[PDB]
Amino acid sequence: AQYEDGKQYTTLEKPVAGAPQVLEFFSFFCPHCYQFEEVLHISDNVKKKLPEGVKMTKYHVNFMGGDLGKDLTQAWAVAMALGVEDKVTVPLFEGVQKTQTIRSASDIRDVFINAGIKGEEYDAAWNSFVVKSLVAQQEKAAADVQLRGVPAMFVNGKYQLNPQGMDTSNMDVFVQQYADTVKYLSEK
Q1: Strands (DSSP E) found in the chain
Q2: CA nearest 71: which of 80, 58, 84, 62?
Q3: What is the dihedral of CA 148, 135, 101, 41, to 10 degrees?
Q4: Cα 179 from chain centroid?
Q5: Residue 15 and residue 120: Cα distance in Å, rounded?
Q6: How far apart are alpha carbons 57 and 165 in whole angstroms?
Q7: Which of 51, 73, 115, 123 has its CA 20 to 30 A from that of 80?
Q8: Please, are residues 127 and 135 in contact by the beta-carbon 8 Å criterion?
Q9: Distance CA 163, CA 178 (A)
Q10: Which region, left, alpha or beta, applies to residue 21 given φ > 0 means left and ψ of -120 to 50 means alpha?
């Protein structure tokens, strides 16, 4: 075929009931995630090609960056609850990987403040139980697929993108292939 199991995607030996339709995992500590987000805009280009009526879920994970990793997963939860993903994603990546000015929960918070979320509102979210279950969700969804690496994408809890099996010599081309694969898997 043109899309074959084991080359552009892999199948899960243990499918995941009631999973989000399109589920992406990343970490602000992950160098390819930085690439996927800042250079390739994968998440964005996928969305531009998905059929109507399909939602994208993106979750942060804990297994990179130790203590600050978890902080970042809680901060990402705050981003999702406040709906400010678009406003912190870029400075969070650059703060962890480019300028390296994020060294503590407090530095993470500065980014939200500089992105215009108010302190009171951030601290309130940070400490809220809505955020606690949002952290819970992120952890559970990674748990359901025994996630050991990022970046990672999963479609309807059954298929996993395999970027290793796509030509990277052109970046525009890698992205479209990736997105088109997600679209094919979506319709499967």
Answers
A1: 9-11, 22-26, 56-60, 152-155, 159-161
A2: 62
A3: 60
A4: 15
A5: 41
A6: 23
A7: 51
A8: no
A9: 7
A10: alpha
Rounded to whole angstroms, the Cα distance separating 4 from 169 reads 21
Tokens standing for residue 58 = 């993106």
Tell me which DSSP letter residue 8 carries: T
What are 185's two structure tokens? Answer: 């898997």
Burial (CB count within 10 angstroms: exposed 0-12, middle 13-18, buried 19+), residue 139: middle
Domains and CATH numbers, the chain: 1-188 (3.40.30.10)
Q: What are 85's two structure tokens?
A: 């993903």
Per the entry, the structure determination technique was: X-ray
Helix%, strand%, coil% for the chain, nearest 5: 55, 10, 35
Give me the count of residues in the chain: 188
